Design a protein around this ligand. Structure first.
Ligand SMILES: CO[C@@H]1O[C@H](CO)[C@H](O)[C@H](O)[C@H]1O
Ligand SMILES: CO[C@@H]1O[C@H](CO)[C@H](O)[C@H](O)[C@H]1O
Ligand SMILES: CO[C@@H]1O[C@H](CO)[C@H](O)[C@H](O)[C@H]1O
Ligand SMILES: [Ca+2]
Ligand SMILES: [Ca+2]
Ligand SMILES: [Ca+2]
Ligand SMILES: [Ca+2]
Ligand SMILES: [Ca+2]
Ligand SMILES: [Ca+2]
Ligand SMILES: [Ca+2]
Ligand SMILES: [Ca+2]
Ligand SMILES: [Ca+2]
Ligand SMILES: [Cl-]
Ligand SMILES: [Cl-]
Lengths: 154, 154, 154
């Protein structure tokens, strides 16, 4: 009895894992994941950078990071408003790095940006980055509230 | 063997619980759920009130109830068309209550509503409530078919 | 006692399997699945017929097939843009078959369709069926890229 039960239990668990993986694939598909491409998702909520980071982390994702034109376009299309990207220069002013470590290899800065502007009155300059409506980038205060767009691997 | 196998299964089960909780969180997020706020979902199907209640019940949710202007706005945004609300005066004519129990704490009745109208010919007056496109409320027959909008906890 | 722990673990597994079924029900609901009707879904990716077949298969579904006016509208609304239907006359020209087998029963052909055009510049004629934005059917090249829409049982 005991051993047959344990073997059935291993089989129940495995079937459950298989079904959940299928559920996850279907969910990604319905959320717009393109074959073999990393995908972006948003709840359309605006919040400070630290919150987006915390939120996406809780989802086992990361704050969206465009690595090329295609991805930048994908994020632009998903967000549809100013959205934080996983890029900051908090560690060393002027040096933008991915939250996932490493210096920028692809950029799409709007003209005259980044400018580490202080005029926002929120304190400090601008150490975070957002993708604005047309896909161009702007450095903004990490304390300002923008759309949360999380990224999941290909 | 046996006890080590059983101990691994506990770990396998626990890991599955966490993964499924993650899937639910991601699904809620993709469905527009805002942090710490209840969310509304619809499949855009129109059906009588009894059907909406059974449907939301099966999904472990409840028929959408606006507790304030914000939520009322969210529900109308989700439904897009006339939808039933979890409020009726079926227990005592004239006294609208939440299906979940209790008297109304917020209302957005359109002018000259509720009127417990009989002119619809479905029999009886009007004991159910629909939120019309412009966020306003109208009492309607529970037998009429309107959009099913379910609500899930904050 | 091992047996007792095993019993409790079996209970946990049952709770999890019901929880996953609920997750699947909620997702289908959020994606527009009507009660007792097939479920249609898309990731809004355009690709050749071969890829749509491959993708839907990986999800354990099939390329969307309208079998009546209702399903036709349902697919049209889901895809929003030209999508492939699981119908083709690849084998024998003029004999449209379902990817799931059998000769075409219900059809919603436009006037002058199917015409098996060749001048598209893709090689061959038109052996696939796309439900154009308007809802009507039009045969097209199975090499052209159209929206991927998969269906799942009622
Ligand atoms: C009109 O956009 C704003 O311009 C400022 C400069 O004046 C800063 O660059 C801000 O970051 C940017 O949001
Ligand atoms: C034109 O709207 C209808 O008006 C009736 C009164 O004439 C009732 O109030 C119905 O509930 C309402 O839907
Ligand atoms: O319109 C186009 O007409 C062609 C014939 O000229 C073919 O039917 C194509 O499939 C159709 O898209
Ligand atoms: Ca079994
Ligand atoms: Ca800076
Ligand atoms: Ca700036
Ligand atoms: Ca293992
Ligand atoms: Ca009444
Ligand atoms: Ca009325
Ligand atoms: Ca042919
Ligand atoms: Ca043909
Ligand atoms: Ca044609
Ligand atoms: Cl900052
Ligand atoms: Cl009624």
């Amino acid at each position: 009895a005991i051993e047959v039960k344990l073997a059935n239990m291993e089989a129940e668990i495995n079937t459950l894992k298989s079904k959940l993986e299928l559920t996850n694939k279907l969910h990604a598909f319905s959320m717009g994941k393109k074959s073999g491409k990393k995908f972006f998702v948003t709840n359309h909520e605006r919040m400070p950078f630290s919150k987006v980071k915390a939120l996406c982390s809780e989802l086992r994702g990361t704050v969206a990071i465009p690595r090329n034109a295609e991805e930048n376009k994908a994020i632009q299309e998903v967000a549809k408003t100013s959205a934080f990207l996983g890029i900051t220069d908090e560690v060393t002013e002027g040096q933008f790095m991915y939250v996932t470590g490493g210096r920028l290899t692809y950029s799409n800065w709007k003209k005259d940006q980044p400018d580490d502007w202080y005029g926002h009155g929120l304190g400090g300059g601008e150490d975070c980055v957002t993708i604005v409506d047309n896909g161009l980038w702007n450095d903004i205060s990490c304390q300002a509230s923008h759309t949360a767009v999380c990224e999941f691997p290909a």
